[PDB]
Amino acid sequence: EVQLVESGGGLVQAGGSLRLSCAASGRTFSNYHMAWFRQAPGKEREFVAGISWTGRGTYYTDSVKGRFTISRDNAKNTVYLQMNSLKPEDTAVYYCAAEGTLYGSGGRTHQSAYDYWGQGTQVTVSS
Amino acid sequence: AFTVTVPKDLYVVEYGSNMTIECKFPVEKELDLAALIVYWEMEDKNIIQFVHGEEDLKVQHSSYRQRARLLKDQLSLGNAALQITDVKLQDAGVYRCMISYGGADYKRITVKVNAP
């Protein structure tokens, strides 16, 4: 019954921009920490960005700080990832994730902290 | 339909007081502690993560070290009661409770602390 659906992925020039969106259904996620993760073929899934349930704390993996911006719209149950200054390192499947029951054990940057995951959207930076 | 309820979503407390803020969930019998998780935060700070019947003090924020308790005997009544000792302006903010007990729910509570 919970579904996260990511959209907005595509092919982009290095230096360019894309906006990812995730539409959540099945329950209201206003009070949940939300995140984007990414995974390249054959590599570990990694944290990209996180936004607090406060609406006013944002968190980024060091390599995307200043390039990517995470935001949310609690009226629409949506999460966004504004990606600027795209780089070869950014090519991956991007997943939006909602807080899981072990968030308080695992921490914001760990996969184990999120119980709900979208199917992912592919971002390819021309490399 | 697992639902957490908060008797109060706003606390106004005096500087230097103890404060206990509450979040309630349905309990009729002995808790299954293998399944129960209680997680209190304020302002993205880990106050108490209670899992496998113990506070995980490794992940607790330094601002709450030896100042916060999850009252275990209240938990047996379906009351996740967070007690803060000796409240200060730093303890004013938005708190959130999470309970997971066959389903999970999350509630926000504003705490206002008055001047010393």
Residue numbers in the entry:
A (entry chain B): 1 to 127
B (entry chain A): 18 to 133
Give passages from the manuscript.
Programmed death-ligand 1 (PD-L1) is a key immune regulatory protein that interacts with programmed cell death protein 1 (PD-1), leading to T-cell suppression. PD-L1 is a 290 residue, type one transmembrane protein, which contains two extracellular domains: an IgV-like domain (PD-L1 D1) that binds to PD-1 and a membrane proximal IgC-like domain (PD-L1 D2). VHHs are single variable domain fragments of heavy chain–only antibodies derived from camelids. We have solved the crystal structures of two representative VHH/PD-L1 complexes, revealing distinct VHH binding modes to overlapping sites.
The crystal structure of VHH6 bound to PD-L1 D1 was solved to a resolution of 1.6 Å and also contained one molecule of the complex in the asymmetric unit. For the VHH, all residues were visible in the electron density map and able to be modeled, while for PD-L1, residues 18 to 132 were able to be modeled. The complex was found to contain a total buried surface area of 1449 Å2 with 727 Å2 for VHH6 and 722 Å2 for PD-L1 D1. All of the residues from VHH6 involved in interactions with PD-L1 are located in the three CDR loops. The contact surface features a network of polar and charge interactions, with each CDR making a salt bridge to PD-L1 D1. W53 from CDR 2 is a key residue losing almost all solvent accessibility and sitting in a pocket on PD-L1 formed by residues E58, E60, D61, R113, and R125. This pocket also accommodates an aromatic ring in both the durvalumab and atezolizumab bound PD-L1 structures. The large network of polar and charged interactions underlies the high affinity of VHH6 for PD-L1, with a KD of 49 nM. This structure reveals an interesting conformation of Y123 within PD-L1, as VHH 6 stabilizes the side chain in a “closed conformation,” resulting in it pointing inward toward the β-sheet of PD-L1. VHH6 contacts nearly all of the PD-L1 residues that are involved in PD-1 binding, with the exception of those interacting with the C’’D loop of PD-1.
